[PDB]
Write a protein that binds this DNA or RNA. Structure first.
Length: 194
RNA sequence: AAUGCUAUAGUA
């Protein structure tokens, strides 16, 4: 997406010659893909575009009558929040074909948000929106969320991101250290010293 | 004011 961003990414690719630099470019490309998907979903769903807002900020957003200092909320950053009919929905954007990666997120959010739900007495429902990049389709974890919007239709294809990722892999396919780094998260360790 | 991965005689 975008032409200036595409040019900046291409300039970053050409000068890149180290495994850590390539890993950083890959991480930023995945983050940009997530940003594209989140912005498009926010535009389609007619809700404000937010990303990783603090939970306590949401608490003061929905009910600005309780003291923020006294309340104790989990430090996770929800991608988005939606308040309707005395129910708060925690929205998390995911761009993967793996249901397991998002059910892990669902369980962690549920076990964390149950304390806040008892303390405030608002039932906190967690929804994870999942899109498969290879074939555009939308999967919703929460039945209530899909009930709120009878149809879920976005028109997005990640052809730009896939081609640049393929170019990056082609440049650094020989680099074994790069292949090790992309396997795990942002925390990178080199080859073992023994 | 500032923002680029390699930024690379003295003190105990």
């Amino acid at each position: 997406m975008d032409y200036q961003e595409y040019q900046q990414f291409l300039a970053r690719i050409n000068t890149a010659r180290d495994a850590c630099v390539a890993k950083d470019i890959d991480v930023d490309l995945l983050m940009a893909r997530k940003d594209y998907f989140g912005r498009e979903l926010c535009k389609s769903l007619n809700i404000e575009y937010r990303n990783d807002v603090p939970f306590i900020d949401i608490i003061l957003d929905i009910r600005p009558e309780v003291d923020p200092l006294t309340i104790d909320a989990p430090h996770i950053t929800p991608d988005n929040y939606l308040y309707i009919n005395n129910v708060l929905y925690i929205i998390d954007y995911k761009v993967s074909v793996s249901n397991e990666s998002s059910v892990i997120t669902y369980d962690k959010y549920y076990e964390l948000t149950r304390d806040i739900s008892d303390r405030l007495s608002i039932p906190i429902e967690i929804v994870i929106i999942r899109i498969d990049p290879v074939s555009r389709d939308l999967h919703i974890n929460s039945d209530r969320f899909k009930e709120l919007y009878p149809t879920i239709v976005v028109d997005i294809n990640f052809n730009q991101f896939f081609d640049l990722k393929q170019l990056l892999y082609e440049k650094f396919g020989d680099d074994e250290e790069f292949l090790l780094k992309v396997a795990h998260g942002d925390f990178t360790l080199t080859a073992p010293w023994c």
